[model samples]
Target chain A: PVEVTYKNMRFLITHNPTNATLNKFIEELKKYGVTTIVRVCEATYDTTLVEKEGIHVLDWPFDDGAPPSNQIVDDWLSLVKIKFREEPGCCIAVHCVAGLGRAPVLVALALIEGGMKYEDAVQFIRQKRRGAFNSKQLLYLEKYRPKMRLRF
Target chain B: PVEVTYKNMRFLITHNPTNATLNKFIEELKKYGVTTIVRVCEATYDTTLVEKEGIHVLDWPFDDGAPPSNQIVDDWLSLVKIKFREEPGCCIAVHCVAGLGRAPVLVALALIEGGMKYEDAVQFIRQKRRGAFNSKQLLYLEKYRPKMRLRF
Candidate 1:
């Protein structure tokens, strides 16, 4: 079963990648005006979902089992701001197949770039998005924050 | 002596504050149509400079003698982009007392956000601006790049 959570941001977490689930998620996202989607799964699966919505997709592949680069993170942050600036009151949905892992980290980075404190960014994501993390993502955020602080 | 470098972006790096230096820097920046300035320096000095220019100043203090955060870096980047978007070819100026430490780091971050690769961004700054860094700024960039990679 998929779990949905809403706060300052909206998140839908699901393990299944079926068309039915994708359709339902798209409908849910439309309710929030989510114009941008960050898909944190394999390219094939995420592309399929992105095609259904006619929206832009940022491929954030966690299943490749490799860490992302700083450039990638910075690009993602820039994209969020770009999307928002292009469309104020727009929504950004980030999801892995399970709604955990890469999605949360990306969202946390977005929140941080949106002017939230690093810790608050992480905490807000965890509290608002169910199944928002795994051990790897949590550890990554811990290290990511101090480095982020250095840039500030 | 104060050095004002006009690269792809504008920068006014001064080691000591003086009306003559600030006036000359502003004169140079006007050629590029740079209106907003991001200041990474001691608050009092920066405030006075901004007041003299009668332009908006974003006070971005490098805290604890450390670099600015990713959020602030992103903001500066966005400011440049927004200015460009509003009036194509509009410029942005970043500065500190010396224009060698925090100033270049901010410029590097802006370049990175503006879609330049990390190494290329660093190189571009060095090529365009002779005093964009000191030994400390270069070290900060080395440390800053890794963490930026993780978030993306």
Candidate 2:
């Protein structure tokens, strides 16, 4: 149940975030008044855990080694806005399996799109949550950075 | 795991609130960044549940038919502060057996102490969580109003 903050944004970063771990962290969010989770894994969080714990969760998976996309980041941004931006005491519990590639990319995009610089977001998250991005994902992140900017 | 809100404060009014219900609401609180529970009961929502969920628990018992006191209210207020007030992202997952008599008394006191009018607080909670105060407790609450006030 660890959280990484970027500016006004906060999210719980996890390793695949399965039943106990995912549910455990989700509970951690409610006391703080956060009320949302976004699972980027192919598999969803434990169904019973989700139902019983009584929180909102969504699964938006990413295809590994397909070089990720701006659309993916965009969709994540949309979800983040709907989930986190619309309220004060809410959060995004974002993760993929291990959080190595996909989760970090989205988090970085989240920060950059929310007005932080890409490298700074990356560095900040790496400090808060280690093993965020592999080389390939970082490359895609840089390439797709422009698409993540909130075009005013 | 059911959640009810009065003003800006949020909590779970529950029965036992320890087993699956307890663990579940605790988990719900986590998503919002809450990690503490103040269970006002015995033989229910006790050590095993807190230990199992790995969250902080404060068990402060008040006897039935003892007529709730402001000292009781003060300790509970203290319990809430210690549990959630020190931190921004914490919650008090509270309960007492079936959550009928004793639980609502504390919730109403919390509202009044948090700057709400006594009548408004009682009405607000009665709407949010039905069957809150037993007739005996309600009489105690009406008489004990001054102590539960935030009035300087």
Candidate 3:
């Protein structure tokens, strides 16, 4: 898992938590003060697993190795905006299957929408997580200019 | 420096060597079996420095933080094609000012042109070189489909 910060908005990039790793992973999340998780892969384990630990799971499931749809991007930005305002300093954990393609792409998108140059956002997240975006995801990021700045 | 391989084609990605670092850098290149150094940034040091060591330098200078022109890409592809076909195991060293943007971008382009999937190529290289490819460079890479396969 890697910690990615965009201004005051903090995020965690990680692989899907299996039952074997759930206990340890939850402890790690606690150390980082993560209260919410945004899972981008289809559920292989129960959502309640993390929810039971009091970490709210926001399932924003997308296909592995694929970029999110326009609607998904909009929804993610809106949700995160609300969270940032309402829950200051609360860390959000993001994960796809391997946390390489899908999860990091979303983080990169959020970073770009928050006013980071697409390249800088990519390099920043990648330096932490390694193997972040696929070419398709990267292209999406390159062309993605949010309608307006979504973060403060 | 990082060693990137697409099929049997091998490349080294590194920062532009300085007067202070050039001697050690050349030694490192020799250990990696590099015979050609492709410098993609504007001339910062004398080309003959490496040439003195019997290493050939191919200067393909371009602006920092910008993607190469189509003509430049074509020329690079043609040159590398010749090298790969004729030299077989010869390793090429590539660099820009930082080895973060232009150098890796060209290597990624070569990998894509050689039939490696764009995402795999980026990940393969980044796993070694860390920060590579600014957004503009990545967009060029994403939209880039070589006119034809330039490598076997």
Candidate 4:
């Protein structure tokens, strides 16, 4: 069971979450009354993503070997915006099987949109979720800036 | 002596230019001709990217792994763009040491921007050039799209 927990960004990341971890995710977020489950990987690992009561899974499949497109990242932010607006008290739980590459970059983007500096955002994600990224992902994060003037 | 010849997209593709081939390039382009020699690979196969008078050498080194960044391509395009403007009727002479990996992907990008479908672009490069790309480069070509609108 992969553990779901926080980093410098305080959002959650996990690798193929164990059902125990999934249950714990619900148990923890249920106390807060709202949670959105965001899965960033597909069924690459033989482990399928499960859906259970009180969990809202948002699927954003990112393959290995390339950075996710700007379009996909925007769509993800759109969903996060809508979810929190609708739920008001909700938090997001995100994961990709590679764990470090997709999930952390996703959060790094989120942090940047929230006005965090790129270096600090990356620094926190790593210290908090230490070793969750590789040189390539780090390079992408280093070079990343929202393609458009960030309206977020 | 690496042979330089025209491809379907037609600038000049070479292995490593042989003394004979290099002379032909000069003889062929001698009138109103200038050459920008571009090396797109990271290599020490023991050769210089430089040619003779009327030629300028540009080293555009791509490291091992994922394809060159869009920034690199745009920069290369910028130099090529200028060489033509200043020299008038000169062309880019391109090559790698020999893996066919970096070499073909660069050409394929040109082919795509010139309006060829990726499959056709990739097919002709592999079949005509006959061994410049494999699954990874092939996949990159299949999925390739300009990150921004292309000027050329």
Give a tens-digit lDDT track for model 4, residues B1-152: 11222222244555654555665545654442436656787534323423546466667777645777777778765564465555555556666765354766776777655545667667766666766677777777666644322333
The local lDDT score (0 to 100) that residue B98 gets in candidate 1 is 44
Residue A61 displacement in candidate 4 (angstroms): 1.4
Higher-scoring candidate on TM-score, 3 or 4: 3
* Total backbone clashes of candidate 1, pairs 3 or more residues apart or in separate chains: 13
lDDT tens string, model 1, A10-43?
A: 3343343566566766676677677766666754
Local lDDT at A73 for model 1: 76
Better of 2 and 3 by TM-score: 3
> Sorted on lDDT, highest at the top, how do the candidates line up?
3, 2, 4, 1
lDDT of 4 at A83: 64
Question: For candidate 4, what's the TM-score of chain A, rounded to 2 decimals?
Answer: 0.72
Top-lDDT structure, candidate number: 3
Which candidate ranks first by DockQ, i.e. highest? Answer: 1
lDDT of 3 by residue, A1-152 (tens): 78888777888887787878888888899888888888788767776677888888888787754668777887888877877778888888888774445888788877866756678888998788666677877777776644433536
What's the best-to-worst order under DockQ?
A: 1, 4, 3, 2
- The DockQ-based CAPRI class assigned to model 3 is incorrect
Task: Output the better candidate (3/4) by lDDT.
Answer: 3
Residue A36 shift from truth in candidate 2, angstroms: 2.1
Per-prediction share of native contacts kept: 0.25, 0.00, 0.00, 0.00
Strongest candidate by TM-score: 3
TM per model? 0.44, 0.43, 0.48, 0.42
State which candidate, 2 or 4, has the greater DockQ: 4
